[PDB]
């Protein structure tokens, strides 16, 4: 079921930092292109995520940005436990590559690719709402 389990990752692309959240159960994606691979940025991301989804647990690496105290603060505040497969991340890279030339800015390509990924079919966008919904309703 794992409705509250997410995974957080940093990709580097075109000397920029894409931050990616995967809802493990559904395969659904959120991504944001951030100016620095900092704990501040990671934590502000996590807040946005948590205000939108029931997030119980976040899986991350030993990234200095993820072991940062700002992230810890966010987690404690919102009641997220932090723990210390990644095909949805690699697929995202692929799609970005595919659509990259369709848009000027990398950020636009990233969000295009997220949209493509979540909507493709059934879909991850549907699976997540279904999962979260069944968990509230039963």
């Amino acid at each position: 079921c794992s409705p509250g389990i997410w995974q957080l990752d940093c990709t580097h692309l075109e000397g920029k930092v894409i931050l990616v959240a995967v809802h493990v159960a559904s395969g659904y994606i959120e991504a944001e292109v951030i100016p620095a691979e900092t704990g501040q940025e990671t934590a502000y991301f996590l807040l946005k995520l948590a205000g939108r989804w029931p997030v119980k647990t976040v899986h991350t690496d030993n990234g200095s940005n993820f072991t940062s105290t700002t992230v810890k603060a966010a987690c404690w505040w919102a009641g997220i436990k932090q723990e210390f497969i990644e095909s949805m991340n690699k697929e995202l890279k692929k799609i970005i590559g595919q659509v990259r030339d369709q848009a000027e800015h990398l950020k636009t390509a990233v969000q295009m690719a997220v949209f493509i990924h979540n909507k493709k079919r059934y879909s991850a966008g549907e699976r997540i709402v279904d999962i979260i919904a069944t968990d509230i309703q039963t």
């Binding site: 105290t69 603060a73 505040w77 919102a78 009641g79």
Partner: protein, 50 residues
Amino acid sequence: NFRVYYRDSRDPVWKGPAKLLWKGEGAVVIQDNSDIKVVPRRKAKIIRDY
């Protein structure tokens, strides 16, 4: 309930959640695990849980 993150030197790194014992004008007394500690108010981030 209230969590204190603090810098207990120049600034290696903010130190993890510590319990607030007392907050006064120029300082805060906190307990980090077993250890009572005193830091200036200005070196202390105090966040209330949701």
